[PDB]
């Protein structure tokens, strides 16, 4: 409808991609090369599913900050055949509050699903799920089970990935560029 729907949807059309797990369908976001991310919860293994086709994953790594604390980012590299568009140059350097984000979500309960989710906190600390979690974004939007892994992005930054919420605010984990530096 808007220059926020207009950059959510470049970002969804060329960087997304449908992963399954034993846990469930979620929204994948491509970074660059075949490496992309995905909420811990989503629990990757040696074999995932990437729009619906058997891929070997090359390699996966839970993040956790210097505190040893859970960020609930998993960077997977993909055994795919195909490199994702480069969108490091859209990562935020720092943390930080925004205004006026955008929650995207493809997956088969939710294709092309866009939420105006309006302005983000820089939470710090959230008990997820009974973990200890850092480097949280929150949203005043009743987000739902299917959204997890959703983009959440302003015009010009892709800031973060949707991995929770309490019925009343959702919760995204951080993007930042140093975590995809190579």
């Known amino acids: 409808?808007?220059?926020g729907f207009d950059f959510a949807q470049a970002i969804m059309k060329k960087n997304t991609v449908?992963?399954?797990?034993?846990?469930g369908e979620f929204t994948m976001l491509g970074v660059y090369d075949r490496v992309a991310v995905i909420p811990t919860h989503a629990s990757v293994g040696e074999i995932i599913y990437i729009n619906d086709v058997e891929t070997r994953v090359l390699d996966a790594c839970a993040l956790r900050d210097l505190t040893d604390t859970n960020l609930e980012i998993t960077?997977?590299?993909l055994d795919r055949n195909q490199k994702f568009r480069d969108i490091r140059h859209f990562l935020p350097r720092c943390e930080d509050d925004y205004n006026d984000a955008v929650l995207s979500v493809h997956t088969s309960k939710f294709p092309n699903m866009y939420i105006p989710v309006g302005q983000v906190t820089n939470y710090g600390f959230l008990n997820?799920?009974?973990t200890p979690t850092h480097r949280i974004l929150m949203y005043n939007f009743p987000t739902r089970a299917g959204q997890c892994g959703g983009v959440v992005t302003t015009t010009g930054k892709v800031i973060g990935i949707h991995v929770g919420g309490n019925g009343a605010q959702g919760f995204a984990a951080m993007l930042?560029?140093?975590?995809?530096?190579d």
């Open 1 to 3: 409808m808007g220059p």
């Open 18 to 23: 449908i992963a399954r797990t034993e846990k």
């Open 75 to 77: 960077i997977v590299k």
């Open 128 to 130: 997820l799920g009974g």
């Open 176 to 181: 930042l560029h140093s975590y995809f530096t």
